Design an enzyme around this catalytic site. Sequence first.
Site, mmCIF file in Angstrom:
data_model
loop_
_atom_site.group_PDB
_atom_site.id
_atom_site.type_symbol
_atom_site.label_atom_id
_atom_site.label_comp_id
_atom_site.label_asym_id
_atom_site.label_seq_id
_atom_site.Cartn_x
_atom_site.Cartn_y
_atom_site.Cartn_z
ATOM 1 N N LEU A 1 0.805 -1.204 0.000
ATOM 2 C CA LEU A 1 0.000 0.000 0.000
ATOM 3 C C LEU A 1 0.853 1.276 0.000
ATOM 4 C CD1 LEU A 1 -2.547 -1.295 2.633
ATOM 5 C CD2 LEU A 1 -2.988 -1.071 0.156
ATOM 6 N N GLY A 2 2.011 1.216 0.643
ATOM 7 C CA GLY A 2 2.892 2.361 0.752
ATOM 8 C C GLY A 2 4.084 2.108 1.644
ATOM 9 N N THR B 1 9.605 6.333 6.246
ATOM 10 C CA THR B 1 10.685 6.167 7.214
ATOM 11 C C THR B 1 10.407 5.020 8.201
ATOM 12 O OG1 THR B 1 9.817 8.034 8.539
ATOM 13 C CG2 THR B 1 11.511 8.552 6.926
ATOM 14 N N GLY C 1 9.071 2.076 7.422
ATOM 15 C CA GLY C 1 9.114 0.783 6.757
ATOM 16 C C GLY C 1 8.027 0.727 5.700
ATOM 17 N N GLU C 2 7.180 -0.324 5.699
ATOM 18 C CA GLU C 2 6.135 -0.457 4.670
ATOM 19 C C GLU C 2 4.790 -0.935 5.230
ATOM 20 O OE1 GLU C 2 8.322 -2.664 1.110
ATOM 21 O OE2 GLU C 2 9.222 -3.133 3.065
ATOM 22 N N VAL C 3 3.688 -0.678 4.524
ATOM 23 C CA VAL C 3 2.383 -1.204 4.918
ATOM 24 C C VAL C 3 1.880 -2.065 3.756
ATOM 25 C CG1 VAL C 3 0.037 -0.761 5.741
ATOM 26 C CG2 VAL C 3 1.907 0.794 6.392
ATOM 27 N N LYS D 1 2.083 -3.674 8.935
ATOM 28 C CA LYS D 1 3.131 -2.654 8.903
ATOM 29 C C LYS D 1 4.423 -3.384 9.240
ATOM 30 C CE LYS D 1 4.234 1.858 11.050
ATOM 31 N NZ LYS D 1 3.724 2.819 12.074
ATOM 32 N N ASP E 1 0.959 13.310 15.604
ATOM 33 C CA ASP E 1 1.028 13.300 14.146
ATOM 34 C C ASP E 1 -0.376 13.277 13.536
ATOM 35 O OD1 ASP E 1 2.720 13.731 11.952
ATOM 36 O OD2 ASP E 1 2.833 11.580 11.501
HETATM 37 C C1 LIG Z 1 0.062 2.727 3.414
HETATM 38 C C2 LIG Z 1 -0.616 3.612 2.407
HETATM 39 C C3 LIG Z 1 -1.897 4.213 2.910
HETATM 40 N N1 LIG Z 1 -2.179 5.308 1.954
HETATM 41 C C4 LIG Z 1 -3.012 3.206 2.947
HETATM 42 N N2 LIG Z 1 -3.674 3.003 1.780
HETATM 43 C C5 LIG Z 1 -4.697 2.097 1.759
HETATM 44 N N3 LIG Z 1 -5.345 1.938 0.534
HETATM 45 C C6 LIG Z 1 -6.474 1.031 0.286
HETATM 46 C C7 LIG Z 1 -6.449 0.773 -1.229
HETATM 47 C C8 LIG Z 1 -5.632 1.881 -1.869
HETATM 48 C C9 LIG Z 1 -5.004 2.672 -0.698
HETATM 49 C C10 LIG Z 1 -5.621 4.042 -0.641
HETATM 50 C C11 LIG Z 1 -5.094 1.372 2.876
HETATM 51 C C12 LIG Z 1 -4.400 1.608 4.045
HETATM 52 C C13 LIG Z 1 -3.360 2.524 4.087
HETATM 53 C C14 LIG Z 1 -2.795 2.581 5.460
HETATM 54 N N4 LIG Z 1 -3.532 1.552 6.197
HETATM 55 C C15 LIG Z 1 -3.272 1.320 7.556
HETATM 56 C C16 LIG Z 1 -4.020 0.455 8.358
HETATM 57 C C17 LIG Z 1 -3.651 0.339 9.694
HETATM 58 C C18 LIG Z 1 -2.556 1.056 10.198
HETATM 59 C C19 LIG Z 1 -1.867 1.872 9.322
HETATM 60 C C20 LIG Z 1 -0.673 2.607 9.679
HETATM 61 N N5 LIG Z 1 -0.014 2.462 10.820
HETATM 62 N N6 LIG Z 1 1.101 3.299 10.779
HETATM 63 C C21 LIG Z 1 1.081 3.908 9.626
HETATM 64 N N7 LIG Z 1 -0.007 3.503 8.915
HETATM 65 C C22 LIG Z 1 -0.100 4.171 7.620
HETATM 66 C C23 LIG Z 1 -1.064 5.337 7.680
HETATM 67 C C24 LIG Z 1 1.361 4.674 7.437
HETATM 68 C C25 LIG Z 1 1.890 4.894 8.893
HETATM 69 N N8 LIG Z 1 -2.197 1.991 8.024
HETATM 70 C C26 LIG Z 1 -4.558 1.025 5.393
HETATM 71 O O1 LIG Z 1 -5.452 0.251 5.697
#
Ligand SMILES: CC[C@@H](N)c1nc(N2CCC[C@H]2C)cc2c1CN(c1cccc(-c3nnc4n3[C@@H](C)CC4)n1)C2=O
Lengths: 289, 285
Positions: free
Chosen positions: B16-17, B20, B22-24, B39, B130
Amino acid sequence: SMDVVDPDIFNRDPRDHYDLLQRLGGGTYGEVFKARDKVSGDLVALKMVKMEPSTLQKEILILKTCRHANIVAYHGSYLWLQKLWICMEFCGAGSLQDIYQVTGSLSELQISYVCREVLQGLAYLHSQKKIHRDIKGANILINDAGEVRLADFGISAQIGAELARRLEFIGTPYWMAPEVAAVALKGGYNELCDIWSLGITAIELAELQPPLFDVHPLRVLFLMTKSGYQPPRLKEKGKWSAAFHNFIKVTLTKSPKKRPSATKMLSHQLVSQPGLNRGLILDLLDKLK
Amino acid sequence: IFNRDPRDHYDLLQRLGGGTYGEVFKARDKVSGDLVALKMVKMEPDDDVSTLQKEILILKTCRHANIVAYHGSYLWLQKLWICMEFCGAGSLQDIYQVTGSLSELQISYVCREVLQGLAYLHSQKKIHRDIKGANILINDAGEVRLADFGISAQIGAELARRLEFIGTPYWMAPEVAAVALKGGYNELCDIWSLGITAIELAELQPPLFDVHPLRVLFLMTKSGYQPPRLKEKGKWSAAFHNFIKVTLTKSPKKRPSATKMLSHQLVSQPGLNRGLILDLLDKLK
Ligand SMILES: CC[C@@H](N)c1nc(N2CCC[C@H]2C)cc2c1CN(c1cccc(-c3nnc4n3[C@@H](C)CC4)n1)C2=O
Ligand SMILES: CC[C@@H](N)c1nc(N2CCC[C@H]2C)cc2c1CN(c1cccc(-c3nnc4n3[C@@H](C)CC4)n1)C2=O
Ligand SMILES: CC[C@@H](N)c1nc(N2CCC[C@H]2C)cc2c1CN(c1cccc(-c3nnc4n3[C@@H](C)CC4)n1)C2=O
Ligand SMILES: [Cl-]
């Protein structure tokens, strides 16, 4: 030559230019030695720091870019065999701590002259966007003429290094509250911290120690941050004039928003009175002997 | 913490992204079929894992409907995976990038839900630190969830590192001592950040987003600094303008708490519910 401001560091033995004399003192920063220029015969102080196999360059640059009578002069540094020797103005009578430990409490006029001189140095430093952050009797030095010089930018350089590196970790600022931005950029306080330190130093010169000196450092921090904390006062009331009591009161203003600047404090009655000159400290030095 | 390969319980689906931290990744449960977000952080041999353990502890101990659900964590071959609820729509920033400006009612609902989570965190002196559109997630059922305790988990360790430097305090000004022991700020910084986030939801970016980050920091530390405002005056109600005005009180001493902000007209009005955001998710198609 590649630096915007050259720190003037010689990669050679300081003994090529100086005759090393007695060790004057030491601490966590390293040591201070007395030395004599091999050609002019003039005395200097060498602050020597043991290196491990940039923040010291920041300390040198803070010092070099000061050109004021109330701040110790800089004469270059030597980096040799893992040691840095910072060469500075020698102050023949030592620090006010070195003096009052033999002499006892300084007189009100002698304290007034020292405060005026420290305020001049502080006004100059603050005009350059510099903060001392370690004002105390041990860092206010006296020369053979009874003149006053501020020394020791060690903590100032450590803070500068800390705040410059902090910018690498703070991330984006747009959602930060102004008090979060102040910590990230400035450490959450400003140059008025030096004015408080001078007020504590005036008590120190009057009582041979700062308030709470025999209380543990971490506990002093704890006591100072309690809600009902009150700024300290001179223990004896009757011994000091109402102008000295008031000078302590305004330099020790709890709120930094109301604590006056160094330039403003120079208009206070205690430090603007006419009889303040190096002759008062020459009297103190006669007592020392 | 599970000492097993998370690939045994989940099939990794799509990154998903990253940043700094790491990755999700998006992942699916191998037996239930439910989707989760993992994560992941690769731990180097000399790293201090204390702040990562604190981040897991915050997520595990939070028992609140406005904070992202936590499932568990995995530690395997020096990779740490934090398993959380997967949000199909992503963050409010991922949403407004496709949908555009949120309505005042949708923003009011979001601010109410964020304040409920902040009130829970602030009651235990936990600071999110944040708050922004990218860290407010919208789950598949339309619920508003705070995510990303990565900064919050590092505050204590940073305060401890900075305390070592403190020399003798006898000549130290009280404001210097207060920053050494208490940090220089408190939980009310999140109330300011929510105010900026409401502007971001309304205008698609925070105030001064086009100004260099360092210049923004310097402007914020001047004595004559003025808090920002909504660009359009007539487009927004008086209650929304006052919400922005009070959340962006320059002095933290006078800034209203999360509980005080929950009584504000903007978020205590009668028609605010998840139907307002499930409508937003419908527009996403
Ligand atoms: C990672 C990219 C983010 N844009 C993103 N996109 C998504 N989708 C769904 C389909 C297309 C896209 C729009 C879906 C998701 C995320 C993030 N996330 C999630 C969920 C739980 C914790 C955290 C979390 N805990 N610490 C951090 N996070 C993140 C906020 C980064 C720092 N994140 C999702 O469920
Ligand atoms: C610690 C030695 C001090 N007791 C002492 N004694 C002296 N005398 C002369 C007669 C006998 C004795 C009483 C004389 C001196 C000192 C210090 N000093 C000096 C001079 C320039 C810079 C610094 C400096 N830059 N960073 C630091 N310093 C120091 C303030 C510590 C941290 N110091 C002198 O000229
Ligand atoms: C280590 C954590 C780092 N992510 C981090 N976070 C921060 N914040 C502020 C809000 C909470 C968190 C997000 C803020 C900071 C850091 C690091 N740093 C800093 C600053 C000066 C020196 C050093 C330094 N000199 N030697 C070493 N350091 C350290 C790098 C360890 C070895 N470090 C900061 O000011
Ligand atoms: Cl910080």
